[PDB]
Amino acid sequence: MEFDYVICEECGKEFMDSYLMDHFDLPTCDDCRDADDKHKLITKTEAKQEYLLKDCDLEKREPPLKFIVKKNPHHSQWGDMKLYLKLQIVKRSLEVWGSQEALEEAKEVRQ
């Protein structure tokens, strides 16, 4: 009868908003984490581009990855700001090359 909660589909954790479900559009909970201490997201520009990619991938299958977009929450607040969950951004960096080390090596090997 009328709800307003959600359970993390990753491991199953009721909740409503945290670091990804509070300003990202992704539920998750304070258990999956990603940075071991915060899961600090990663700028969408340094997330895919750096991961050797930029669109055409995360929109080719339409995965459960969400992003934020607005003034930065920490110090320094430029005009707009596009960010993408870091954990999910890592799952893709591998799905493509398979590891952030295969990326760093792909850019150091290529010209």
Which positions lie near Zn ion, rule CB under 5 A?
8, 10-11, 13, 29, 31-32
Residue closer to Zn ion (CB basis): 33 or 71:
33
State the minimum distance, in angstroms, from the CB of residue 29 to Zn ion. 4
Q: Does the annotation flag 32 for ligand binding? A: yes
The residue of the chain with the least Cβ separation from Zn ion equals 8
Residue closer to Zn ion (CB basis): 26 or 103:
26
Q: Rounded to an integer, what distance in angstroms lies between the CA atom of residue 39 and that of residue 19?
A: 8
Q: Does the annotation flag 8 for ligand binding? A: yes
Q: Rounded to an integer, what distance in angstroms lies between the CA atom of residue 11 and that of residue 95?
A: 20
State the minimum distance, in angstroms, from the CB of residue 92 to Zn ion. 18
Residue closer to Zn ion (CB basis): 7 or 69:
7
Q: Which residues are annotated as a binding site for Zn(2+)?
A: 8, 11, 29, 32
